[PDB]
mmCIF file of N, CA and C and ligand atoms in Angstrom:
data_model
loop_
_atom_site.group_PDB
_atom_site.id
_atom_site.type_symbol
_atom_site.label_atom_id
_atom_site.label_comp_id
_atom_site.label_asym_id
_atom_site.label_seq_id
_atom_site.Cartn_x
_atom_site.Cartn_y
_atom_site.Cartn_z
ATOM 1 N N UNK A 1 -22.932 59.239 -15.606
ATOM 2 C CA UNK A 1 -24.016 58.705 -14.788
ATOM 3 C C UNK A 1 -24.106 59.409 -13.433
ATOM 4 N N UNK A 2 -25.185 59.136 -12.692
ATOM 5 C CA UNK A 2 -25.295 59.668 -11.339
ATOM 6 C C UNK A 2 -24.204 59.112 -10.429
ATOM 7 N N UNK A 3 -23.818 57.842 -10.618
ATOM 8 C CA UNK A 3 -22.715 57.280 -9.840
ATOM 9 C C UNK A 3 -21.412 58.026 -10.106
ATOM 10 N N UNK A 4 -21.216 58.504 -11.337
ATOM 11 C CA UNK A 4 -19.995 59.229 -11.667
ATOM 12 C C UNK A 4 -20.027 60.656 -11.132
ATOM 13 N N UNK A 5 -21.184 61.319 -11.197
ATOM 14 C CA UNK A 5 -21.269 62.665 -10.646
ATOM 15 C C UNK A 5 -21.094 62.652 -9.134
ATOM 16 N N UNK A 6 -21.544 61.586 -8.465
ATOM 17 C CA UNK A 6 -21.291 61.455 -7.034
ATOM 18 C C UNK A 6 -19.796 61.320 -6.742
ATOM 19 N N UNK A 7 -19.065 60.611 -7.604
ATOM 20 C CA UNK A 7 -17.627 60.466 -7.413
ATOM 21 C C UNK A 7 -16.936 61.820 -7.511
ATOM 22 N N UNK A 8 -17.276 62.604 -8.539
ATOM 23 C CA UNK A 8 -16.636 63.906 -8.692
ATOM 24 C C UNK A 8 -17.055 64.878 -7.597
ATOM 25 N N UNK A 9 -18.279 64.756 -7.072
ATOM 26 C CA UNK A 9 -18.651 65.612 -5.959
ATOM 27 C C UNK A 9 -17.841 65.284 -4.710
ATOM 28 N N UNK A 10 -17.598 63.993 -4.448
ATOM 29 C CA UNK A 10 -16.735 63.633 -3.325
ATOM 30 C C UNK A 10 -15.320 64.165 -3.535
ATOM 31 N N UNK A 11 -14.826 64.124 -4.777
ATOM 32 C CA UNK A 11 -13.504 64.675 -5.047
ATOM 33 C C UNK A 11 -13.462 66.168 -4.731
ATOM 34 N N UNK A 12 -14.489 66.921 -5.143
ATOM 35 C CA UNK A 12 -14.514 68.359 -4.864
ATOM 36 C C UNK A 12 -14.549 68.654 -3.369
ATOM 37 N N UNK A 13 -15.337 67.890 -2.603
ATOM 38 C CA UNK A 13 -15.371 68.058 -1.152
ATOM 39 C C UNK A 13 -13.986 67.823 -0.555
ATOM 40 N N UNK A 14 -13.313 66.764 -0.999
ATOM 41 C CA UNK A 14 -11.971 66.463 -0.514
ATOM 42 C C UNK A 14 -11.004 67.601 -0.843
ATOM 43 N N UNK A 15 -11.048 68.098 -2.084
ATOM 44 C CA UNK A 15 -10.103 69.130 -2.511
ATOM 45 C C UNK A 15 -10.360 70.458 -1.810
ATOM 46 N N UNK A 16 -11.626 70.800 -1.530
ATOM 47 C CA UNK A 16 -11.909 72.020 -0.780
ATOM 48 C C UNK A 16 -11.342 71.918 0.625
ATOM 49 N N UNK A 17 -11.429 70.735 1.220
ATOM 50 C CA UNK A 17 -10.923 70.574 2.575
ATOM 51 C C UNK A 17 -9.397 70.675 2.619
ATOM 52 N N UNK A 18 -8.698 70.031 1.678
ATOM 53 C CA UNK A 18 -7.238 70.177 1.609
ATOM 54 C C UNK A 18 -6.861 71.640 1.405
ATOM 55 N N UNK A 19 -7.506 72.305 0.440
ATOM 56 C CA UNK A 19 -7.131 73.683 0.120
ATOM 57 C C UNK A 19 -7.386 74.602 1.302
ATOM 58 N N UNK A 20 -8.489 74.379 2.023
ATOM 59 C CA UNK A 20 -8.771 75.181 3.207
ATOM 60 C C UNK A 20 -7.677 75.025 4.257
ATOM 61 N N UNK A 21 -7.217 73.790 4.480
ATOM 62 C CA UNK A 21 -6.176 73.555 5.472
ATOM 63 C C UNK A 21 -4.859 74.214 5.081
ATOM 64 N N UNK A 22 -4.561 74.284 3.783
ATOM 65 C CA UNK A 22 -3.378 75.016 3.344
ATOM 66 C C UNK A 22 -3.563 76.517 3.527
ATOM 67 N N UNK A 23 -4.757 77.030 3.211
ATOM 68 C CA UNK A 23 -4.997 78.468 3.198
ATOM 69 C C UNK A 23 -5.038 79.079 4.594
ATOM 70 N N UNK A 24 -5.375 78.300 5.628
ATOM 71 C CA UNK A 24 -5.379 78.853 6.980
ATOM 72 C C UNK A 24 -4.024 78.719 7.667
ATOM 73 N N UNK A 25 -3.055 78.073 7.026
ATOM 74 C CA UNK A 25 -1.722 77.926 7.595
ATOM 75 C C UNK A 25 -0.968 79.248 7.448
ATOM 76 N N UNK A 26 -0.482 79.795 8.575
ATOM 77 C CA UNK A 26 0.178 81.105 8.552
ATOM 78 C C UNK A 26 1.385 81.134 7.621
ATOM 79 N N UNK A 27 2.075 80.005 7.459
ATOM 80 C CA UNK A 27 3.232 79.955 6.570
ATOM 81 C C UNK A 27 2.866 80.255 5.126
ATOM 82 N N UNK A 28 1.617 80.002 4.738
ATOM 83 C CA UNK A 28 1.229 80.021 3.332
ATOM 84 C C UNK A 28 0.401 81.243 2.978
ATOM 85 N N UNK A 29 0.386 82.252 3.854
ATOM 86 C CA UNK A 29 -0.439 83.430 3.612
ATOM 87 C C UNK A 29 -0.084 84.113 2.293
ATOM 88 N N UNK A 30 1.201 84.141 1.921
ATOM 89 C CA UNK A 30 1.581 84.830 0.685
ATOM 90 C C UNK A 30 1.015 84.133 -0.545
ATOM 91 N N UNK A 31 0.572 82.886 -0.410
ATOM 92 C CA UNK A 31 0.034 82.127 -1.529
ATOM 93 C C UNK A 31 -1.485 82.142 -1.579
ATOM 94 N N UNK A 32 -2.148 82.904 -0.710
ATOM 95 C CA UNK A 32 -3.601 82.797 -0.600
ATOM 96 C C UNK A 32 -4.360 83.649 -1.607
ATOM 97 N N UNK A 33 -3.746 84.683 -2.165
ATOM 98 C CA UNK A 33 -4.430 85.607 -3.058
ATOM 99 C C UNK A 33 -3.556 85.875 -4.268
ATOM 100 N N UNK A 34 -4.148 86.305 -5.387
ATOM 101 C CA UNK A 34 -3.331 86.687 -6.546
ATOM 102 C C UNK A 34 -2.352 87.798 -6.189
ATOM 103 N N UNK A 35 -1.174 87.745 -6.810
ATOM 104 C CA UNK A 35 -0.188 88.803 -6.624
ATOM 105 C C UNK A 35 -0.720 90.096 -7.228
ATOM 106 N N UNK A 36 -0.654 91.182 -6.455
ATOM 107 C CA UNK A 36 -1.198 92.471 -6.870
ATOM 108 C C UNK A 36 -0.149 93.242 -7.663
ATOM 109 N N UNK A 37 -0.403 93.583 -8.931
ATOM 110 C CA UNK A 37 0.598 94.354 -9.690
ATOM 111 C C UNK A 37 0.906 95.707 -9.075
ATOM 112 N N UNK A 38 -0.056 96.318 -8.379
ATOM 113 C CA UNK A 38 0.225 97.564 -7.677
ATOM 114 C C UNK A 38 1.283 97.358 -6.600
ATOM 115 N N UNK A 39 1.189 96.255 -5.852
ATOM 116 C CA UNK A 39 2.175 95.982 -4.814
ATOM 117 C C UNK A 39 3.436 95.336 -5.375
ATOM 118 N N UNK A 40 3.333 94.639 -6.505
ATOM 119 C CA UNK A 40 4.478 93.988 -7.143
ATOM 120 C C UNK A 40 4.390 94.183 -8.653
ATOM 121 N N UNK A 41 4.984 95.243 -9.211
ATOM 122 C CA UNK A 41 4.827 95.471 -10.659
ATOM 123 C C UNK A 41 5.621 94.493 -11.501
ATOM 124 N N UNK A 42 6.755 94.016 -10.990
ATOM 125 C CA UNK A 42 7.651 93.174 -11.769
ATOM 126 C C UNK A 42 7.133 91.754 -11.940
ATOM 127 N N UNK A 43 6.021 91.396 -11.288
ATOM 128 C CA UNK A 43 5.640 89.990 -11.204
ATOM 129 C C UNK A 43 5.132 89.472 -12.545
ATOM 130 N N UNK A 44 4.235 90.220 -13.190
ATOM 131 C CA UNK A 44 3.689 89.769 -14.466
ATOM 132 C C UNK A 44 4.762 89.678 -15.545
ATOM 133 N N UNK A 45 5.903 90.348 -15.359
ATOM 134 C CA UNK A 45 6.988 90.249 -16.329
ATOM 135 C C UNK A 45 7.823 88.992 -16.140
ATOM 136 N N UNK A 46 7.721 88.338 -14.984
ATOM 137 C CA UNK A 46 8.447 87.106 -14.739
ATOM 138 C C UNK A 46 7.547 85.872 -14.809
ATOM 139 N N UNK A 47 6.287 85.978 -14.387
ATOM 140 C CA UNK A 47 5.406 84.828 -14.192
ATOM 141 C C UNK A 47 4.295 84.877 -15.231
ATOM 142 N N UNK A 48 4.308 83.924 -16.160
ATOM 143 C CA UNK A 48 3.348 83.940 -17.254
ATOM 144 C C UNK A 48 2.038 83.244 -16.918
ATOM 145 N N UNK A 49 2.017 82.376 -15.904
ATOM 146 C CA UNK A 49 0.814 81.636 -15.532
ATOM 147 C C UNK A 49 0.619 81.708 -14.023
ATOM 148 N N UNK A 50 0.046 82.801 -13.522
ATOM 149 C CA UNK A 50 -0.136 82.964 -12.074
ATOM 150 C C UNK A 50 -1.118 81.952 -11.494
ATOM 151 N N UNK A 51 -0.865 81.559 -10.247
ATOM 152 C CA UNK A 51 -1.761 80.641 -9.558
ATOM 153 C C UNK A 51 -1.672 80.929 -8.064
ATOM 154 N N UNK A 52 -2.791 80.763 -7.364
ATOM 155 C CA UNK A 52 -2.855 80.988 -5.922
ATOM 156 C C UNK A 52 -3.995 80.157 -5.351
ATOM 157 N N UNK A 53 -4.068 80.099 -4.015
ATOM 158 C CA UNK A 53 -5.033 79.192 -3.393
ATOM 159 C C UNK A 53 -6.470 79.669 -3.566
ATOM 160 N N UNK A 54 -6.698 80.980 -3.678
ATOM 161 C CA UNK A 54 -8.055 81.449 -3.946
ATOM 162 C C UNK A 54 -8.496 81.049 -5.347
ATOM 163 N N UNK A 55 -7.579 81.105 -6.315
ATOM 164 C CA UNK A 55 -7.915 80.690 -7.671
ATOM 165 C C UNK A 55 -8.152 79.191 -7.745
ATOM 166 N N UNK A 56 -7.430 78.410 -6.934
ATOM 167 C CA UNK A 56 -7.674 76.972 -6.869
ATOM 168 C C UNK A 56 -9.095 76.692 -6.391
ATOM 169 N N UNK A 57 -9.552 77.404 -5.356
ATOM 170 C CA UNK A 57 -10.913 77.190 -4.854
ATOM 171 C C UNK A 57 -11.939 77.497 -5.942
ATOM 172 N N UNK A 58 -11.741 78.593 -6.685
ATOM 173 C CA UNK A 58 -12.659 78.932 -7.777
ATOM 174 C C UNK A 58 -12.714 77.832 -8.830
ATOM 175 N N UNK A 59 -11.564 77.244 -9.163
ATOM 176 C CA UNK A 59 -11.531 76.184 -10.161
ATOM 177 C C UNK A 59 -12.203 74.908 -9.654
ATOM 178 N N UNK A 60 -12.079 74.599 -8.359
ATOM 179 C CA UNK A 60 -12.812 73.452 -7.821
ATOM 180 C C UNK A 60 -14.307 73.638 -8.064
ATOM 181 N N UNK A 61 -14.821 74.834 -7.758
ATOM 182 C CA UNK A 61 -16.254 75.092 -7.855
ATOM 183 C C UNK A 61 -16.732 75.201 -9.297
ATOM 184 N N UNK A 62 -15.828 75.441 -10.246
ATOM 185 C CA UNK A 62 -16.126 75.375 -11.674
ATOM 186 C C UNK A 62 -15.937 73.978 -12.251
ATOM 187 N N UNK A 63 -15.749 72.961 -11.403
ATOM 188 C CA UNK A 63 -15.578 71.577 -11.848
ATOM 189 C C UNK A 63 -14.370 71.411 -12.772
ATOM 190 N N UNK A 64 -13.310 72.195 -12.563
ATOM 191 C CA UNK A 64 -12.132 72.090 -13.413
ATOM 192 C C UNK A 64 -11.208 70.934 -13.050
ATOM 193 N N UNK A 65 -11.321 70.362 -11.856
ATOM 194 C CA UNK A 65 -10.456 69.257 -11.457
ATOM 195 C C UNK A 65 -11.273 67.974 -11.455
ATOM 196 N N UNK A 66 -10.926 67.042 -12.340
ATOM 197 C CA UNK A 66 -11.572 65.735 -12.339
ATOM 198 C C UNK A 66 -10.699 64.649 -11.741
ATOM 199 N N UNK A 67 -9.434 64.943 -11.437
ATOM 200 C CA UNK A 67 -8.549 63.997 -10.780
ATOM 201 C C UNK A 67 -7.697 64.769 -9.784
ATOM 202 N N UNK A 68 -7.135 64.050 -8.812
ATOM 203 C CA UNK A 68 -6.238 64.697 -7.859
ATOM 204 C C UNK A 68 -4.982 65.191 -8.569
ATOM 205 N N UNK A 69 -4.547 64.485 -9.623
ATOM 206 C CA UNK A 69 -3.349 64.908 -10.351
ATOM 207 C C UNK A 69 -3.546 66.259 -11.030
ATOM 208 N N UNK A 70 -4.747 66.529 -11.550
ATOM 209 C CA UNK A 70 -5.028 67.854 -12.103
ATOM 210 C C UNK A 70 -4.921 68.933 -11.029
ATOM 211 N N UNK A 71 -5.371 68.625 -9.813
ATOM 212 C CA UNK A 71 -5.262 69.563 -8.698
ATOM 213 C C UNK A 71 -3.803 69.796 -8.321
ATOM 214 N N UNK A 72 -3.033 68.715 -8.199
ATOM 215 C CA UNK A 72 -1.638 68.856 -7.789
ATOM 216 C C UNK A 72 -0.827 69.617 -8.828
ATOM 217 N N UNK A 73 -1.227 69.567 -10.104
ATOM 218 C CA UNK A 73 -0.524 70.376 -11.098
ATOM 219 C C UNK A 73 -0.652 71.869 -10.791
ATOM 220 N N UNK A 74 -1.790 72.303 -10.239
ATOM 221 C CA UNK A 74 -1.902 73.707 -9.862
ATOM 222 C C UNK A 74 -1.192 74.005 -8.539
ATOM 223 N N UNK A 75 -1.184 73.069 -7.585
ATOM 224 C CA UNK A 75 -0.345 73.261 -6.399
ATOM 225 C C UNK A 75 1.119 73.360 -6.812
ATOM 226 N N UNK A 76 1.548 72.479 -7.724
ATOM 227 C CA UNK A 76 2.922 72.516 -8.210
ATOM 228 C C UNK A 76 3.242 73.835 -8.906
ATOM 229 N N UNK A 77 2.255 74.441 -9.578
ATOM 230 C CA UNK A 77 2.471 75.714 -10.266
ATOM 231 C C UNK A 77 2.630 76.868 -9.276
ATOM 232 N N UNK A 78 1.837 76.877 -8.198
ATOM 233 C CA UNK A 78 2.054 77.856 -7.134
ATOM 234 C C UNK A 78 3.502 77.798 -6.664
ATOM 235 N N UNK A 79 4.003 76.585 -6.413
ATOM 236 C CA UNK A 79 5.363 76.428 -5.902
ATOM 237 C C UNK A 79 6.393 76.861 -6.941
ATOM 238 N N UNK A 80 6.280 76.346 -8.169
ATOM 239 C CA UNK A 80 7.308 76.651 -9.164
ATOM 240 C C UNK A 80 7.320 78.135 -9.519
ATOM 241 N N UNK A 81 6.158 78.793 -9.528
ATOM 242 C CA UNK A 81 6.126 80.238 -9.748
ATOM 243 C C UNK A 81 6.918 80.972 -8.670
ATOM 244 N N UNK A 82 6.740 80.571 -7.404
ATOM 245 C CA UNK A 82 7.462 81.222 -6.311
ATOM 246 C C UNK A 82 8.969 80.996 -6.422
ATOM 247 N N UNK A 83 9.387 79.799 -6.827
ATOM 248 C CA UNK A 83 10.814 79.539 -6.964
ATOM 249 C C UNK A 83 11.410 80.360 -8.102
ATOM 250 N N UNK A 84 10.671 80.503 -9.208
ATOM 251 C CA UNK A 84 11.179 81.266 -10.346
ATOM 252 C C UNK A 84 11.240 82.758 -10.034
ATOM 253 N N UNK A 85 10.237 83.281 -9.328
ATOM 254 C CA UNK A 85 10.238 84.698 -8.984
ATOM 255 C C UNK A 85 11.227 85.043 -7.869
ATOM 256 N N UNK A 86 11.678 84.064 -7.081
ATOM 257 C CA UNK A 86 12.560 84.300 -5.934
ATOM 258 C C UNK A 86 13.852 83.499 -6.039
ATOM 259 N N UNK A 87 14.669 83.749 -7.061
ATOM 260 C CA UNK A 87 15.853 82.912 -7.275
ATOM 261 C C UNK A 87 17.108 83.327 -6.523
ATOM 262 N N UNK A 88 17.107 84.471 -5.847
ATOM 263 C CA UNK A 88 18.333 85.093 -5.357
ATOM 264 C C UNK A 88 18.724 84.527 -3.990
ATOM 265 N N UNK A 89 19.957 84.833 -3.556
ATOM 266 C CA UNK A 89 20.410 84.387 -2.238
ATOM 267 C C UNK A 89 19.898 85.258 -1.097
ATOM 268 N N UNK A 90 19.203 86.355 -1.397
ATOM 269 C CA UNK A 90 18.726 87.268 -0.369
ATOM 270 C C UNK A 90 17.778 86.551 0.598
ATOM 271 N N UNK A 91 17.748 86.972 1.870
ATOM 272 C CA UNK A 91 16.872 86.295 2.845
ATOM 273 C C UNK A 91 15.396 86.358 2.494
ATOM 274 N N UNK A 92 14.934 87.456 1.888
ATOM 275 C CA UNK A 92 13.544 87.522 1.450
ATOM 276 C C UNK A 92 13.199 86.442 0.437
ATOM 277 N N UNK A 93 14.075 86.236 -0.553
ATOM 278 C CA UNK A 93 13.891 85.166 -1.534
ATOM 279 C C UNK A 93 13.937 83.794 -0.873
ATOM 280 N N UNK A 94 14.913 83.578 0.012
ATOM 281 C CA UNK A 94 15.061 82.257 0.606
ATOM 282 C C UNK A 94 13.863 81.907 1.479
ATOM 283 N N UNK A 95 13.267 82.910 2.131
ATOM 284 C CA UNK A 95 12.104 82.667 2.977
ATOM 285 C C UNK A 95 10.904 82.243 2.137
ATOM 286 N N UNK A 96 10.664 82.927 1.019
ATOM 287 C CA UNK A 96 9.533 82.538 0.172
ATOM 288 C C UNK A 96 9.754 81.149 -0.418
ATOM 289 N N UNK A 97 10.985 80.847 -0.856
ATOM 290 C CA UNK A 97 11.269 79.524 -1.412
ATOM 291 C C UNK A 97 11.057 78.427 -0.376
ATOM 292 N N UNK A 98 11.457 78.676 0.878
ATOM 293 C CA UNK A 98 11.222 77.688 1.927
ATOM 294 C C UNK A 98 9.727 77.439 2.124
ATOM 295 N N UNK A 99 8.936 78.510 2.138
ATOM 296 C CA UNK A 99 7.495 78.374 2.336
ATOM 297 C C UNK A 99 6.840 77.678 1.149
ATOM 298 N N UNK A 100 7.325 77.962 -0.058
ATOM 299 C CA UNK A 100 6.779 77.332 -1.254
ATOM 300 C C UNK A 100 7.037 75.836 -1.261
ATOM 301 N N UNK A 101 8.247 75.420 -0.880
ATOM 302 C CA UNK A 101 8.531 73.998 -0.809
ATOM 303 C C UNK A 101 7.717 73.337 0.291
ATOM 304 N N UNK A 102 7.470 74.052 1.391
ATOM 305 C CA UNK A 102 6.635 73.496 2.457
ATOM 306 C C UNK A 102 5.173 73.365 2.023
ATOM 307 N N UNK A 103 4.667 74.318 1.236
ATOM 308 C CA UNK A 103 3.302 74.222 0.718
ATOM 309 C C UNK A 103 3.126 72.973 -0.136
ATOM 310 N N UNK A 104 4.055 72.758 -1.065
ATOM 311 C CA UNK A 104 4.040 71.582 -1.934
ATOM 312 C C UNK A 104 4.158 70.287 -1.136
ATOM 313 N N UNK A 105 5.139 70.213 -0.230
ATOM 314 C CA UNK A 105 5.313 69.008 0.576
ATOM 315 C C UNK A 105 4.089 68.727 1.446
ATOM 316 N N UNK A 106 3.482 69.774 2.004
ATOM 317 C CA UNK A 106 2.316 69.591 2.871
ATOM 318 C C UNK A 106 1.119 69.058 2.088
ATOM 319 N N UNK A 107 0.849 69.642 0.916
ATOM 320 C CA UNK A 107 -0.250 69.160 0.079
ATOM 321 C C UNK A 107 -0.041 67.699 -0.315
ATOM 322 N N UNK A 108 1.169 67.346 -0.771
ATOM 323 C CA UNK A 108 1.413 65.958 -1.160
ATOM 324 C C UNK A 108 1.266 65.013 0.030
ATOM 325 N N UNK A 109 1.682 65.452 1.225
ATOM 326 C CA UNK A 109 1.626 64.585 2.401
ATOM 327 C C UNK A 109 0.189 64.345 2.851
ATOM 328 N N UNK A 110 -0.654 65.380 2.794
ATOM 329 C CA UNK A 110 -2.059 65.210 3.163
ATOM 330 C C UNK A 110 -2.721 64.213 2.228
ATOM 331 N N UNK A 111 -2.463 64.350 0.926
ATOM 332 C CA UNK A 111 -3.084 63.462 -0.051
ATOM 333 C C UNK A 111 -2.572 62.036 0.127
ATOM 334 N N UNK A 112 -1.269 61.880 0.364
ATOM 335 C CA UNK A 112 -0.730 60.539 0.549
ATOM 336 C C UNK A 112 -1.328 59.866 1.776
ATOM 337 N N UNK A 113 -1.619 60.631 2.823
ATOM 338 C CA UNK A 113 -2.125 60.042 4.047
ATOM 339 C C UNK A 113 -3.634 59.845 4.041
ATOM 340 N N UNK A 114 -4.382 60.627 3.255
ATOM 341 C CA UNK A 114 -5.831 60.688 3.409
ATOM 342 C C UNK A 114 -6.635 60.309 2.171
ATOM 343 N N UNK A 115 -6.027 60.222 0.998
ATOM 344 C CA UNK A 115 -6.756 59.877 -0.215
ATOM 345 C C UNK A 115 -6.594 58.386 -0.497
ATOM 346 N N UNK A 116 -7.715 57.676 -0.631
ATOM 347 C CA UNK A 116 -7.661 56.266 -1.008
ATOM 348 C C UNK A 116 -7.195 56.134 -2.452
ATOM 349 N N UNK A 117 -6.205 55.257 -2.683
ATOM 350 C CA UNK A 117 -5.643 55.096 -4.020
ATOM 351 C C UNK A 117 -6.665 54.547 -5.011
ATOM 352 N N UNK A 118 -7.635 53.756 -4.537
ATOM 353 C CA UNK A 118 -8.687 53.277 -5.433
ATOM 354 C C UNK A 118 -9.657 54.390 -5.801
ATOM 355 N N UNK A 119 -9.824 55.386 -4.923
ATOM 356 C CA UNK A 119 -10.658 56.530 -5.273
ATOM 357 C C UNK A 119 -10.001 57.366 -6.367
ATOM 358 N N UNK A 120 -8.696 57.627 -6.247
ATOM 359 C CA UNK A 120 -8.026 58.378 -7.304
ATOM 360 C C UNK A 120 -8.048 57.599 -8.612
ATOM 361 N N UNK A 121 -7.902 56.270 -8.543
ATOM 362 C CA UNK A 121 -7.939 55.460 -9.760
ATOM 363 C C UNK A 121 -9.312 55.512 -10.425
ATOM 364 N N UNK A 122 -10.386 55.476 -9.634
ATOM 365 C CA UNK A 122 -11.722 55.593 -10.213
ATOM 366 C C UNK A 122 -11.888 56.920 -10.946
ATOM 367 N N UNK A 123 -11.446 58.020 -10.327
ATOM 368 C CA UNK A 123 -11.549 59.323 -10.985
ATOM 369 C C UNK A 123 -10.818 59.316 -12.321
ATOM 370 N N UNK A 124 -9.617 58.729 -12.355
ATOM 371 C CA UNK A 124 -8.850 58.657 -13.593
ATOM 372 C C UNK A 124 -9.603 57.870 -14.657
ATOM 373 N N UNK A 125 -10.204 56.739 -14.274
ATOM 374 C CA UNK A 125 -10.857 55.900 -15.269
ATOM 375 C C UNK A 125 -12.142 56.536 -15.786
ATOM 376 N N UNK A 126 -12.880 57.262 -14.943
ATOM 377 C CA UNK A 126 -14.023 58.019 -15.450
ATOM 378 C C UNK A 126 -13.554 59.075 -16.444
ATOM 379 N N UNK A 127 -12.454 59.767 -16.123
ATOM 380 C CA UNK A 127 -11.963 60.840 -16.989
ATOM 381 C C UNK A 127 -11.509 60.298 -18.340
ATOM 382 N N UNK A 128 -10.737 59.208 -18.332
ATOM 383 C CA UNK A 128 -10.291 58.586 -19.575
ATOM 384 C C UNK A 128 -11.451 58.090 -20.432
ATOM 385 N N UNK A 129 -12.619 57.858 -19.837
ATOM 386 C CA UNK A 129 -13.790 57.398 -20.574
ATOM 387 C C UNK A 129 -14.561 58.534 -21.232
ATOM 388 N N UNK A 130 -14.157 59.781 -21.012
ATOM 389 C CA UNK A 130 -14.860 60.927 -21.577
ATOM 390 C C UNK A 130 -14.006 61.620 -22.643
HETATM 391 C C1 G6B B 201 4.322 84.736 -3.523
HETATM 392 C C2 G6B B 201 5.567 85.408 -4.113
HETATM 393 O O1 G6B B 201 6.161 84.853 -5.043
HETATM 394 C C3 G6B B 201 6.095 86.499 -3.506
HETATM 395 N N1 G6B B 201 7.442 86.653 -3.629
HETATM 396 C C4 G6B B 201 7.974 87.726 -3.017
HETATM 397 N N2 G6B B 201 9.290 88.047 -3.039
HETATM 398 C C5 G6B B 201 9.799 89.105 -2.339
HETATM 399 O O2 G6B B 201 9.162 89.863 -1.608
HETATM 400 C C6 G6B B 201 11.312 89.343 -2.486
HETATM 401 C C7 G6B B 201 11.871 89.820 -1.138
HETATM 402 N N3 G6B B 201 11.999 88.125 -2.930
HETATM 403 S S1 G6B B 201 6.734 88.528 -2.289
HETATM 404 C C8 G6B B 201 5.517 87.491 -2.756
HETATM 405 C C9 G6B B 201 4.258 87.795 -2.380
HETATM 406 C C10 G6B B 201 3.169 87.709 -3.251
HETATM 407 C C11 G6B B 201 1.885 88.063 -2.834
HETATM 408 C C12 G6B B 201 1.675 88.552 -1.548
HETATM 409 C C13 G6B B 201 2.756 88.681 -0.678
HETATM 410 N N4 G6B B 201 2.554 89.151 0.555
HETATM 411 C C14 G6B B 201 4.038 88.314 -1.100
#
């Protein structure tokens, strides 16, 4: 219905705003664009499902997220990919892992503070009805 399309449009506006706030944070610059195989050849051999904040924005605009949980699964994938690709004790690895955990914690904290729980529940119930 039109009432349901209005709900999903509000969800997309909310998700674009969260993603923008993550993408302008200097700590998260390494997560803003797809990893370039020219700059990192070994990446596609370790990471089977790449994800980044620019790809998240594209998926919002393709109506791929109908619930906040679907969105957080891709935020969680950005983080888990970084942890898997950077497992070593070296300072370069530890720095990326710290930033990845901060990206995940920041996204969850914004949603916990700013998303109405009844709004997320409505999105879930519309989705389960389709
Ligand atoms: C996001 C990620 O997993 C990632 N990990 C790196 N690890 C390392 O450089 C070594 C030291 N552990 S670099 C890097 C990355 C990816 C895209 C762009 C830029 N600037 C960095």
